[PDB]
Design an enzyme around this catalytic site. Structure first.
Site, PDB file in Angstrom:
ATOM      1  N   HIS A 100      52.253  26.660  68.237  1.00  0.00           N
ATOM      2  CA  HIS A 100      52.844  26.958  69.539  1.00  0.00           C
ATOM      3  C   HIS A 100      52.186  28.141  70.244  1.00  0.00           C
ATOM      4  O   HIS A 100      52.592  28.489  71.359  1.00  0.00           O
ATOM      5  CB  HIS A 100      54.369  27.153  69.417  1.00  0.00           C
ATOM      6  CG  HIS A 100      54.818  28.432  68.776  1.00  0.00           C
ATOM      7  ND1 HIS A 100      55.365  28.463  67.513  1.00  0.00           N
ATOM      8  CD2 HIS A 100      54.948  29.687  69.268  1.00  0.00           C
ATOM      9  CE1 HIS A 100      55.757  29.691  67.233  1.00  0.00           C
ATOM     10  NE2 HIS A 100      55.510  30.458  68.275  1.00  0.00           N
TER      11      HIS A 100
ATOM     12  N   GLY B 218      57.228  38.091  68.556  1.00  0.00           N
ATOM     13  CA  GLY B 218      55.885  38.419  68.150  1.00  0.00           C
ATOM     14  C   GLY B 218      55.625  38.297  66.663  1.00  0.00           C
ATOM     15  O   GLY B 218      54.479  38.467  66.243  1.00  0.00           O
TER      16      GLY B 218
ATOM     17  N   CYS C  69      55.855  35.558  64.795  1.00  0.00           N
ATOM     18  CA  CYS C  69      55.365  34.267  64.345  1.00  0.00           C
ATOM     19  C   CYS C  69      53.969  34.377  63.756  1.00  0.00           C
ATOM     20  O   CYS C  69      53.141  35.197  64.185  1.00  0.00           O
ATOM     21  CB  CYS C  69      55.361  33.263  65.480  1.00  0.00           C
ATOM     22  SG  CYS C  69      57.044  32.736  65.808  1.00  0.00           S
TER      23      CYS C  69
END
Ligand SMILES: *[C@H](O)[C@H](C[C@@H]1CCNC1=O)NC(=O)[C@H](CC(C)C)NC(=O)OC[C@@H]1C[C@H]1CCC
Lengths: 300, 297
Positions: free
Chosen positions: A39, A141, A143
């Protein structure tokens, strides 16, 4: 007993940041490949309902900004494997440890190196719940932060972080991009199954208590595995698998208490309660220490 | 979530130090290795070791320092309080920017537990009011260090020396001075009565609220001194005005005045938790500082 993480240095040496447009998350740099959540290619507006194959076809190598610190790593190839992006880079990471990619089972624990902008902020121990969530500490942030175990020289990567659920728990994938649990990487409301207690880890905790001389709960009875499993489910405890019985082997051998005898002791605790007594200084049964964790803290 | 600092910068400093049949860990910064002086003891020395006398009888070559498969040659040694400083002929290229600090009780730090110079685990500890720490340390863990990381700078605050009969732990700062009334001799030692770190309990209650847990709140309030009277009765540390000030950000973030949270804690101390749990725990947790809570929320 405390939650003890693995030393994080071998993983710290692999963390990078990956940006597409203004979307930045963390990636894992091993040899000449960087792994990250797919993503990263999504605008905030596209996360609501992303078509990943379509978004990726419009991307080229030169749309990906990979940085170790502030040093750019040139991307020379890209591909999508399930929910992870693999970015081939032109430099092999000189800090690459011996490593493997593993898919863990519910109940297993691992260390999470929480990262922001490719910079490690903290390390903590997590258990994979039976409903395939973890009770992480993750902010925007985070991920691409990874979970791992270390055995001798070898880092076993088992988790990469992708999302938070409405209930505050966290979900993600293995390093092949396959989600744990019934989740998808879309910005849609998703609920986990009702959670349950990790029986194999409660048993590990009872063995730990015995090792430390706290053994009032040992009874004279035994049970079959099937009888125990059927009772345990009525108390929202997980059934045991054959692998669970096997991983309790070392603690059973150390104490001389057969696994099924300990199951019968746990069954009595479930059916009768503690009666105002404690085990290891607690009236609560702990379910986030695995049999290995117990052996870790009791040996070295 | 109890969260330790990333340990890599400290891992690159850990070495093994051996004297006689005694092996423990050392901390290798630039060209100096720091380690507990009791490495020079034998079985019979440990009861009442005269360290200056034991040390003068040692040569540089009685110390075997190993960094992985590489031996480092000791070219000098000195003693600073309860720490031995071994000068070696090689500089550690992995030495981080660092300082040595002495922490205050109630402050937290990360411990990198090591055996034979090799890292085994990392976890967060608090310096207790009675100057023990509730660690997880086994035989061979001495010389393991505690630290905090600010920016890229590692502040070393703890080196491990001993376990007490109660199972808690004691050690020194990196100048070799013990935290607490303890001594590096092989004797059973008791600590002073421990107390609970009140400012940390309050920080953790605020964390429980931030994560949507509020069953323990109430509409009552209390003065600072009236709260402190109750706190001291229950062997909680007194809350100072600086503590109240330090809690401001969490108070603002949640809209709960510090003294309103003090009134909630008072109610918890007098009635217990009546079976309920806060952030998973059946007990009030006191090893998260206000900064620890903020950094993570
Ligand atoms: C150094 O590795 C070691 C670490 C302790 C071993 C077990 N758990 C530990 O944290 N330190 C020591 O063994 C100490 C050495 C002395 C000279 C300071 N001694 C010690 O910790 O003894 C523990 C038991 C309670 C005390 C009773 C003494 C008669």
């Amino acid at each position: 007993f405390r939650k003890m993480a693995f030393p994080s240095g071998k993983v710290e040496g692999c963390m990078v940041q990956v940006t597409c447009g203004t979307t930045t998350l963390n990636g894992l740099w091993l040899d000449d490949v960087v792994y990250c959540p797919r993503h990263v290619i999504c605008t905030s507006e596209d996360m609501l309902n992303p078509n990943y194959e379509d978004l990726l076809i419009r991307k080229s190598n030169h749309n990906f900004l990979v940085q170790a610190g502030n040093v750019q790593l040139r991307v020379i190839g890209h591909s999508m494997q399930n929910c992870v992006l693999k970015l081939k880079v032109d430099t092999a990471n000189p800090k690459t440890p011996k490593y493997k990619f593993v898919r863990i089972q519910p109940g297993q624990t691992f260390s999470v190196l929480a990262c922001y902008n490719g910079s490690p902020s903290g390390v903590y121990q997590c258990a994979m719940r039976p409903n395939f969530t973890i009770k992480g500490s993750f902010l925007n942030g985070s991920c691409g932060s990874v979970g791992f175990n270390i055995d001798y020289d070898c880092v076993s990567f088992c988790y990469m972080h992708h999302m938070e659920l409405p209930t505050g728990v966290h979900a993600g994938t293995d390093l092949e991009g396959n989600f744990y649990g019934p989740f998808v990487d879309r910005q849609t409301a998703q609920a986990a199954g009702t959670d349950t207690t990790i029986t194999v880890n409660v048993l590990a905790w009872l063995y730990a208590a015995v090792i430390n001389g706290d053994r009032w709960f040992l009874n004279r009875f035994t049970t079959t595995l099937n009888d125990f499993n059927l009772v345990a489910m009525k108390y929202n405890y997980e059934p045991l698998t054959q692998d669970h019985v096997d991983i309790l082997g070392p603690l059973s051998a150390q104490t001389g208490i057969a696994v099924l005898d300990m199951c019968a002791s746990l069954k009595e605790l479930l059916q009768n309660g503690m009666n105002g007594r404690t085990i290891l200084g607690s009236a609560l049964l702990e379910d986030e220490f695995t049999p290995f964790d117990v052996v870790r803290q009791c040996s070295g």
